[PDB]
Each structure stands twice: as structure tokens, then as C-alpha cells.
């Protein structure tokens, strides 16, 4: 029973990490957030240069 519990916990941890990675891959507006921040910086630079 202890072995089963430990194995289940390990599998849960591995599955949680895999789910985190999968959600990061499929949720991933983060690249879009970075590109929007880059466009904001470029617009700020165009405002400072004008």
C-alpha cells in the first residue's frame, strides 16, 4: 500500500508537470504579450524620435 501510494504521488507530480507544460504550450498568449510589448516599445521610440 505504501509503495502504491508513493507511485501514485510520483505519477501525480509527473502528470502535473506535463500538464503545466502542455497548458503553457497551448495557452500561449505569452509570445503575443511579448510582441505587443515590443510594438509598444517601438511606438514609444517613434514618439520620442518625433
Amino acid at each position: 500500500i505504501v509503495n502504491l501510494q508513493v507511485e501514485m504521488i510520483k505519477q501525480f507530480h509527473m502528470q502535473l508537470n506535463e500538464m503545466h507544460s502542455l497548458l503553457e504550450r497551448y495557452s500561449v498568449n505569452e509570445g503575443l504579450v511579448a510582441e505587443i510589448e515590443r510594438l509598444r516599445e517601438e511606438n514609444k521610440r517613434l514618439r520620442a524620435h518625433f
Binding site: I1, V2, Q5, V6, M8, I9, K10, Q11, F12, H13, M14, L16, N17
Partner: protein, 115 residues
């Protein structure tokens, strides 16, 4: 007094011989197991655990390991340094390996899930 988590992490790194970055999945699994409610150990009585270990070693015809275990237990009892002898005895019993049984070389097949 290093926190038990840091000590366990250092122990894992030392035993496996890998960096913390290479053991992240194993560290997460270990943290999940330790934080997970585990069924009570088979024996939580120092004398009962010692007697069970002696009986198991005698039944397996491992008299040398039984004598070594009895000597180590006598030394631990006389030293009086450990407060929870039953816990250490249970751990040692749980980690005991039959020296006659060739360590079951973990089949390369386990690597399939590692990727």
C-alpha cells in the same frame, strides 16, 4: 539546522550524482510522495521491527546479514543517540536488499517514458 527539504535535496543530488536541474522531475515526484499521506509503515515498534527483520533474515538463510543487523541494532540501542529507534529500524528494513538476489538491473525500457 538545514531545513529537511534542503537536506533531502542535497541527499538526492549526492546519491544520484546529478545536478538539481537534471533531477527536477524526480524532485517533484519525491516532494509529492513525501507530502502525500502514506499508509503506516509495516512495523512502528523498534522491538517488533527488529524481531521481524531477524525472522525475515533467518528465513532467507542470510545469517551474515542478520548478525550484522543484530550488531548494528545493539550498537544503536547502547549508544542512545537516536530518539526514534523504531523509525530508523523501519527505514532500514524497508531498504533491505537480499544480497543473494542479483540487483534487478532496471530494464532500459524505463527510458521510454523519460523522454
Amino acid at each position: 539546522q538545514k531545513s529537511p527539504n534542503v537536506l533531502l535535496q542535497n541527499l538526492c543530488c549526492r546519491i544520484l550524482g546529478r545536478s538539481e536541474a537534471d533531477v527536477a522531475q524526480q524532485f517533484q515526484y519525491a516532494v509529492r510522495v513525501i507530502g502525500s499521506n502514506f499508509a503506516p509503515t509495516v512495523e512502528r515498534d523498534e522491538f517488533l521491527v527488529a524481531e521481524k527483520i531477524k525472522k525475515e533474515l533467518i528465513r532467507q538463510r542470510r545469517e551474515a546479514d542478520a548478525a550484522l543487523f543484530s550488531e548494528l541494532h545493539r550498537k544503536l540501542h547502547s549508544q542512545g543517540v537516536l530518539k526514534n529507534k523504531w523509525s530508523i529500524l523501519y527505514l532500514l528494513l524497508s531498504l533491505s536488499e537480499d544480497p543473494r538476489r542479483q540487483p534487478s538491473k532496471v530494464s532500459s525500457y524505463a527510458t521510454l517514458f523519460a523522454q
